[PDB]
Amino acid sequence: AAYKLVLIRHGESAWNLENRFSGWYDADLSPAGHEEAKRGGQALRDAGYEFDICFTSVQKRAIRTLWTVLDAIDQMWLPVVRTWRLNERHYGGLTGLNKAETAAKHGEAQVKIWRRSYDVPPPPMEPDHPFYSNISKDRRYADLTEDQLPSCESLKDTIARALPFWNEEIVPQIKEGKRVLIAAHGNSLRGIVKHLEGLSEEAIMELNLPTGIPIVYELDKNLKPIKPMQFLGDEET
Amino acid sequence: AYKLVLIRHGESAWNLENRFSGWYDADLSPAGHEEAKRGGQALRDAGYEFDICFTSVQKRAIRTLWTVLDAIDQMWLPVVRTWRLNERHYGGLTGLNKAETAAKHGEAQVKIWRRSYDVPPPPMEPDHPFYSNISKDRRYADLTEDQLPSCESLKDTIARALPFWNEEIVPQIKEGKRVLIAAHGNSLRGIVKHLEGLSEEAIMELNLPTGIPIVYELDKNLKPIKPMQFLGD
């Protein structure tokens, strides 16, 4: 095919072990998540993959995933572009709560609604939230407009702010012939896959990308996949 | 009162910093990595904040920057890589230790290369074990035939570093962005010579320490207001 695109979702994070909602909280990879990224990078290396430009988020679990991959494929010299628009979904007032605290505060009915809904956001992250200043006041978002900095996101919102970066910055590079690697998060990559494959809301909500695994798209010149996404790695994985 | 921070990477693998590593893409040794950690330590203790980072395309510098960014919790910063910040290209000497250099070319010629600002070493020829490894490396594929060196005098090195400084770094400094630069001995020499208006002899005598933040305070014309200061204990 004309073009080749590779995606990778970061592995386990420090708060995954605590089953706390991270969202825009900047949790690091756990040691296992780091090893996952090493194995994904080794897979890209064994297949001889070469890239020309990399995109990631401003969250260190994704950036460290990208770094680990670039180390394993000996392409640390590649240009790297970071953007908030590839960040994980913003989980609003749920940020920092674990599974038990979430169920305790909101009830399983409300939680089920948030789980299966495409466009209903979680509560907003208010100024008295324990991570409000940690996230909303982080200088890395200093240049965001008031309507750009979310207090909370539905999956719809997440995709709606990821896809402008895709269209305006990634698509031109792919059509320039550059081999792109995107290292990001479950829900931002969902936005990209939903656009690539023309998936429905239900279908994208049922899609769970595996972690630490290179995802390969073969694309024609209009960036339509010519075959299903392919996972790279040993036969087991 | 702009703030500019430079950091020179530390020790590379296989003693290659005592072997004219130049454009060979040697990785840091564990000790050189530890050095970068200590420098990042120092910067975080001091509460330094950056807005943009510049480095070479060589992994010992890149990994140094990565280690600093990790230590100061600023991995989200934008990073620009450029070959123009590469270490000096030592041509045919690349990879040889001091004894092998003397044995191959003689003490008199080696002293001349050591002390001269504008006499390059001999070119890296196809028989050199690094010739195809460096000259056919994909990251240089866009360089014009005049741009890809086979060897560099110190003069050459500074001459290709300065256009990047003037065209890319200066405008960021003038916008008030706090710049971090992680690079190599001789490209950083280029920056320092331009900053302090040093002479050729002076720049050849200056030996920047490794793994230590080097802090510059510049006025509205990018002229240092005081000597460079080092960050540590």
Ligand SMILES: O=C(O)c1sc(-c2ccc(Cl)cc2)cc1NS(=O)(=O)c1ccc(-c2ccccc2)cc1
């Ligand atoms: O079970 C399920 O898959 C989901 S998804 C979901 C949900 C999705 C979107 C919104 Cl906005 C709100 C909620 C709720 C549940 N149920 S849960 O028991 O309360 C639960 C709560 C947290 C976790 C967790 C585990 C690791 C790291 C971080 C969090 C797992 C489960």
Ligand SMILES: [Cl-]
């Ligand atoms: Cl980077």
